[PDB]
């Protein structure tokens, strides 16, 4: 899961 703007990965 990649956050739309920040592109931060969240498993």
């Amino acid at each position, epitope marked *: *899961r*990649k*956050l*739309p*703007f*920040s*592109k*931060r990965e*969240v498993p």
Partner: antibody, heavy 119, light 107 residues
Framework: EVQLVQSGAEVKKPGASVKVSCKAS????????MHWVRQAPGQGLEWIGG????????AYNQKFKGRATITRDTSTSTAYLELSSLRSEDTAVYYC????????????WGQGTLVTVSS | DIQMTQSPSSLSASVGDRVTITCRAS?????IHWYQQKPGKAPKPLIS???NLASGVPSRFSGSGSGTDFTLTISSLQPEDFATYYC?????????FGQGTKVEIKR
């Protein structure tokens, strides 16, 4: 169940500021982004900006840069949009919406907050 | 900024008709998302990444396209499909939306 609950409708004078809240529940608030989208008579939908709680910052559409402030309180799972130097063109319904995954549409939206700019 | 242009801006059709809404991006995008907005309500996700139906979306909705040209198809228009449809891109900042397409029902 995911819920995004916004603050009530407001009237503000031109030049004043407005601060709208969006209380989130039913998911891990710090693991998603919160975005602000407005619907003005003149246009369809316009992205204002948003926030990833694990960044201590916020992203803005260049149009709103320097006039909007997007904040978040991780303790109450509340996202806020503050719009300053209000003009007639700012009369609009403001929606908060969850940014869950880049491959998926903004999946949950608040009920909207109508802000009217009038003297 | 990437400008999203929908055509037509409004259409009317009967229940059971096949309806199409195009979305053109001014510059190539990886994909688009579609939203459906009922009057007095917030937009709801309809299609994710050009062709994937959002949660609870009936099979009569489909999305196709690539680069700058995209289509939303409603294979058998139903009364509850009365809404404004919006396309959106977030491949480039600022994120932008189409102007919306109002779908009205002839009966």
């Amino acid at each position: 169940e995911v819920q995004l609950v916004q603050s009530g409708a407001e009237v503000k004078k031109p030049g004043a500021s407005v601060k709208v809240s969006c209380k989130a529940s039913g998911y891990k608030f710090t693991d998603s982004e919160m975005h602000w989208v407005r619907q003005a008579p003149g246009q369809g939908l316009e992205w204002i900006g948003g926030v990833d709680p694990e960044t201590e910052g916020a992203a803005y559409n260049q149009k709103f840069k320097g006039r909007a402030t997007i904040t978040r309180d991780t303790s109450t799972s509340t996202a806020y949009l503050e719009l300053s130097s209000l003009r007639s063109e700012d009369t609009a319904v403001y929606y908060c919406t969850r940014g869950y995954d880049y491959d998926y549409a903004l999946d949950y939206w608040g009920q909207g907050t109508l802000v009217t700019v009038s003297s | 900024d990437i400008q999203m242009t929908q055509s037509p801006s409004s259409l009317s059709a009967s229940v059971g008709d096949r309806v199409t809404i195009t979305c053109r991006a001014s510059s190539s995008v990886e994909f688009i998302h579609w939203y459906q907005q009922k009057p007095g309500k917030a937009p709801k996700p309809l299609i994710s990444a050009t062709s994937n139906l959002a949660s609870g979306v009936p099979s009569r909705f489909s999305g196709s396209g690539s680069g700058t040209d995209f289509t939303l198809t409603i294979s058998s228009l139903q009364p509850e499909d009365f809404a404004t449809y919006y396309c959106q891109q977030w491949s480039s900042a600022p994120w932008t939306f189409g102007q919306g397409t109002k779908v009205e029902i002839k009966r």
